[PDB]
Design a binder for this molecule. Sequence first.
Ligand SMILES: Cc1cc2nc3c(=O)[nH]c(=O)nc-3n(C[C@H](O)[C@H](O)[C@H](O)COP(=O)(O)OP(=O)(O)OC[C@H]3O[C@@H](n4cnc5c(N)ncnc54)[C@H](O)[C@@H]3O)c2cc1C
Ligand SMILES: Cc1cc2nc3c(=O)[nH]c(=O)nc-3n(C[C@H](O)[C@H](O)[C@H](O)COP(=O)(O)OP(=O)(O)OC[C@H]3O[C@@H](n4cnc5c(N)ncnc54)[C@H](O)[C@@H]3O)c2cc1C
Ligand SMILES: CCN(CC)CCC[C@@H](C)Nc1ccnc2cc(Cl)ccc12
Ligand SMILES: CCN(CC)CCC[C@@H](C)Nc1ccnc2cc(Cl)ccc12
Ligand SMILES: [Zn+2]
Ligand SMILES: [Zn+2]
Lengths: 230, 230
Amino acid sequence: AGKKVLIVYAHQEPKSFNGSLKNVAVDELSRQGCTVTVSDLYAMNFEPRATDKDITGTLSNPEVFNYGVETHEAYKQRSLASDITDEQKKVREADLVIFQFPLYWFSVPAILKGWMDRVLCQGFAFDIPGFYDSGLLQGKLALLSVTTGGTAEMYTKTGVNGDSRYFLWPLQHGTLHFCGFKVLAPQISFAPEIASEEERKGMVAAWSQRLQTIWKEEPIPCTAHWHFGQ
Amino acid sequence: AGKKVLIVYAHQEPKSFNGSLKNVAVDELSRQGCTVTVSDLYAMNFEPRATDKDITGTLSNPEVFNYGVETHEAYKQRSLASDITDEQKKVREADLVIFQFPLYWFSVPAILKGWMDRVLCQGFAFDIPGFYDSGLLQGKLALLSVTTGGTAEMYTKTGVNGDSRYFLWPLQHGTLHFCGFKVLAPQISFAPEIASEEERKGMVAAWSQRLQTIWKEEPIPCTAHWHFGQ
Ligand SMILES: Cc1cc2nc3c(=O)[nH]c(=O)nc-3n(C[C@H](O)[C@H](O)[C@H](O)COP(=O)(O)OP(=O)(O)OC[C@H]3O[C@@H](n4cnc5c(N)ncnc54)[C@H](O)[C@@H]3O)c2cc1C
Ligand SMILES: Cc1cc2nc3c(=O)[nH]c(=O)nc-3n(C[C@H](O)[C@H](O)[C@H](O)COP(=O)(O)OP(=O)(O)OC[C@H]3O[C@@H](n4cnc5c(N)ncnc54)[C@H](O)[C@@H]3O)c2cc1C
Ligand SMILES: CCN(CC)CCC[C@@H](C)Nc1ccnc2cc(Cl)ccc12
Ligand SMILES: CCN(CC)CCC[C@@H](C)Nc1ccnc2cc(Cl)ccc12
Ligand SMILES: [Zn+2]
Ligand SMILES: [Zn+2]
């Protein structure tokens, strides 16, 4: 049958390299017949802050507010904020979640960090216990499509940045695997600003071409060994 | 002399375990005679999103928005938003920057990620050249004071989360070292919600006591080996 894809997109500028990577993914996945949804976080003015406004109603323990405890309960009570609830429906129904973003400080831009913090709540994405291979989003795939300022060479073990896989750990393992996702190999488009027009068009085409057979891919083993070696 | 400290604090609840760690830091560093400032990001409703509103000057290219370029240029003309500008003054003058936060998704809460993204702009925190040991915040000390849900056992090589050092890499190396900070050993207070009240009190006391002698500690070698090696 057909597949559902959610692209969580975090760039301010539609004409950016990120925007182009997002658009070619929509084009290609749409052409295949997939159901495609894009959460364009900056266009949505998506709220990144984890606050008590994320629960509508009386808190369990208002005297000492604990975001995790209160959102866990709100999830069960169906009292989370609308924005969170709407994202959760998209994730729940998705077969594949693609994150499209520029690397900010070896991680996701804060608006996307806020999506992770607020949407992937206890009771929805994981339980304690009920994580990693017992996470609640088991059966789903995730894929990081990241662009960098630094070159591939800088992101090697002997480059000033260390290997690119090193910075993936909190995202792939600590977040996605934790919630039970299987993780498809990352798409890292290095240093588009430095690249020539030809190399840039090539990186966009490579992503589109990869997407043609994305459903045939197997996920990585999201292990310490995969990320760090030895 | 040389004992200005900025605490960048990211917890919603003054009565929280994080709040207590922040407060004992203020108490002890104030007692020493340090100059102490706290940026209480949630109380400030701090903006986490990197947007064009961060520039108060005329955009150089309003047709195609490039956050990096526009903020770099605006920094040099004192044309960044006042919230950023005010944080930059605090960092510029600080001799030590402590980050106090609960671990969210193997990283900082989004509101604190947004402080990093928006405050540490090119021209202020780094330049090219002017990064890693040559970063523009060279000579300053930084320290991560992190609290977790996961237990100490979980954050070992034999545990499900891997060594805690693994998740520090984007923060300590990719952010702090990149901007020229020397990085003091992290303070990780594991699993306060699982600890008894007395055990929590012990963790708070340990931090207060560590701070008595913080100014003469040796920084870590902020290398891949420290983070991922034996
Ligand atoms: C706050 C912050 C923190 C950062 N931290 C890091 C970090 O830790 N590590 C790191 O490596 N980098 C870092 N960077 C840099 C950042 O990752 C890059 O600037 C970003 O990845 C560039 O992607 P972009 O989409 O903005 O590029 P763009 O500047 O939009 O793209 C580059 C060029 O590609 C062109 N283009 C767009 N579409 C196409 C197309 N279809 N075909 C051909 N050309 C096209 C554009 O017009 C442009 O000329 C940071 C940046 C910021 C702002
Ligand atoms: C969105 C999200 C993502 C998360 N991701 C992760 C993750 O990736 N990895 C991970 O390990 N954890 C994760 N967690 C868990 C999170 O790190 C913990 O919930 C957090 O660190 C707990 O710290 P706290 O200050 O909020 O605790 P609190 O709940 O505030 O503290 C516990 C108790 O300490 C009491 N207390 C306060 N002061 C004192 C004192 N002086 N002496 C004794 N007791 C005191 C409080 O009253 C409270 O009852 C995540 C949580 C959320 C919400
Ligand atoms: C000389 C090149 N300059 C000067 C303006 C163009 C700006 C390019 C910017 C986006 N590159 C970067 C911006 C911010 N952080 C980074 C971190 C790493 Cl590791 C590598 C490159 C980065
Ligand atoms: C009131 C219910 N209490 C039990 C004490 C829940 C406390 C458990 C919470 C903090 N644990 C966690 C919450 C959220 N994420 C996590 C990620 C990892 Cl890796 C490990 C533990 C996590
Ligand atoms: Zn994993
Ligand atoms: Zn380092």
